[PDB]
């Protein structure tokens, strides 16, 4: 009896998603354990047939990946007891363990340095509310306007943002509430705003910048390259597999809600 | 009395953050999946010593058939395969016998398509960038792109060729190399090295396409994200998982197959890298 790993994620063609992935490969791998990959195109009814799946194929432990943990899916495992770790998501309730960066002072320090370059309306592009990362980010991002005594303003909050076709569109959203610069959550939307303000002429750095969430490859693949928060993909995934490794092998876990460092890569989309 | 053994596919790829091998994994999965098989998927990263051992592990795990893909199948990796006699398909590289089934576009009339478009839009120095040229896929590549030259009366150059190149690091590397012989244009096989091409000649400030144009090899999920916009040839990449699983899935039922070199038609999509 292997052990086998059950690993839930988007899709395999994301770049975020497959960076995460790989290291969870890498320690499976250097363990001999089984990997099961499915791919659930963020959608919930497939998520709760692939857990059905899993229960049935007997897998040791789970590792989710998704733009969130829908409450259908946190009752699937409770009622399973399957060892679960999340990966770039956070539970609510702060019990299903978890690998993460700290959101909030990523929004903070990227705010601060938008601030610092003397921005003055700033915009925050980000995925769901409904979510802890972007309620984190929402705090960081108000923390900074307060600090330098900007008001906050509602509208130059833009939630619910996941692909580079919402990022284009936003780009003349942004211009009429004379926003100078964004910090955007999605590498993605990153891309497709920076495209859009490129093809309207708007000059970058010197006119708008802009700060992106992860630094996945595709971050680099825009000129202007883009500046942003670096998540360590890599690092998630295999710091995520080792803390199932314990989870399933039994061993006392004292602090289940990791936090990995991030750091700001400065690139040519900031002055 | 129990029934068999559920079926099981073997998928080896250098590696899942290649968003052209992903693309293709997934048609493989969606067709395996239909039939409820049980997929595993292993990584590479195109190293022979590496895809030596998970053949081992696939053959020792019974796996009932196997899809490859990679750069190309090595003598030690095909002679395995024909000692362990399981189905196998290759997909996106071609077998020199050509015994082994394989699903594939047409390289040699990409690669011409690719050159006639950089002649016709004024270019007279014109780099192809490829992997390994002994490679079956690579010497057509190059057999179109000579066509191309010969047509329009401009000579062959060996030294706007340029071998072994499969990342986005390697791309960038090459753009002074290019522009230090002349070069004004480049055909890539691989998107990774294209869209570091691009990044390069855009770090430089190198006017794209007035002064320099690109044209990339697959139209890969990344190439989405470029600026400028990346012109590529368009393969069917989700549509060459597919085909190749849905042959395997024939060969595992002991089907016989009279066609197993499956070749897929491309399109070019003119973007903001060419003129």
Same mark, same amino acid.
């Given at each position: 009896?292997?052990?086998?790993?059950?690993?839930?994620?988007?899709?395999?063609?994301?770049?975020?998603?497959?960076?995460?992935?790989?290291?969870?490969?890498?320690?499976?791998?250097?363990?001999?354990?089984?990997?099961?990959?499915?791919?659930?195109?963020?959608? !919930?009814?497939?998520?709760?047939?692939?857990?059905?799946?899993?229960?049935?194929?007997?897998?040791?432990?789970? !590792?989710?990946?998704?733009?969130?943990?829908?409450?259908?899916?946190?009752?699937?495992?409770?009622?399973?007891?399957?060892? !679960?770790?999340?990966?770039?998501?956070?539970?609510?309730?702060?019990?299903?363990?978890? %690998?993460?960066?700290?959101?909030?002072?990523?929004?903070?320090?990227?705010?601060?340095?938008?601030?610092?370059?003397?921005?003055?309306?700033?915009?925050?592009?980000?995925?769901?509310?409904?979510?802890?990362?972007?309620?984190?980010?929402? %705090?960081?991002?108000?923390?900074?306007?307060?600090?330098?005594?900007?008001?906050?303003?509602?509208?130059?909050?833009?939630?619910?943002?996941?692909?580079?076709?919402?990022?284009?569109?936003?780009?003349?959203?942004?211009?009429?509430?004379?926003?100078?610069?964004?910090? %955007?959550?999605?590498?993605? %939307?990153?891309?497709?705003?920076?495209?859009?303000?490129?093809?309207?002429?708007?000059? !970058?750095?010197?006119?708008?910048?802009?700060?992106?969430?992860?630094?996945?490859?595709?971050?680099?693949?825009?000129?202007?390259?883009?500046?942003?928060?670096?998540?360590?993909?890599?690092?998630?995934?295999?710091?995520?597999?080792?803390?199932?490794?314990?989870?399933?092998?039994?061993?006392?876990?004292?602090?289940?809600?990791?936090?990995?460092?991030?750091?700001?890569?400065?690139?040519?989309?900031?002055?």
């Amino acid at each position: 009896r292997t052990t086998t790993v059950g690993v839930i994620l988007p899709t395999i063609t994301s770049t975020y998603f497959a960076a995460i992935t790989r290291g969870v490969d890498d320690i499976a791998s250097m363990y001999k354990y089984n990997m099961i990959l499915a791919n659930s195109d963020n959608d !919930v009814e497939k998520e709760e047939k692939v857990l059905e799946t899993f229960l049935s194929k007997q897998v040791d432990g789970i !590792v989710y990946m998704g733009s969130s943990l829908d409450e259908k899916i946190r009752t699937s495992l409770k009622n399973s007891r399957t060892p !679960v770790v999340l990966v770039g998501t956070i539970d609510g309730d702060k019990e299903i363990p978890s %690998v993460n960066i700290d959101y909030h002072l990523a929004a903070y320090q990227s705010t601060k340095k938008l601030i610092d370059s003397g921005n003055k309306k700033i915009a925050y592009i980000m995925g769901s509310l409904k979510d802890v990362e972007n309620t984190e980010r929402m %705090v960081g991002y108000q923390e900074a306007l307060l600090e330098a005594n900007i008001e906050f303003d509602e509208n130059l909050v833009f939630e619910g943002n996941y692909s580079y076709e919402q990022g284009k569109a936003l780009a003349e959203r942004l211009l009429e509430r004379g926003a100078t610069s964004a910090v %955007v959550s999605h590498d993605t %939307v990153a891309v497709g705003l920076l495209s859009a303000m490129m093809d309207k002429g708007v000059k !970058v750095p010197e006119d708008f910048e802009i700060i992106s969430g992860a630094n996945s490859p595709i971050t680099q693949y825009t000129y202007p390259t883009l500046t942003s928060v670096n998540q360590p993909l890599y690092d998630l995934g295999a710091v995520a597999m080792r803390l199932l490794t314990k989870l399933m092998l039994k061993e006392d876990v004292e602090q289940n809600q990791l936090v990995l460092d991030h750091e700001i890569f400065s690139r040519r989309s900031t002055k």
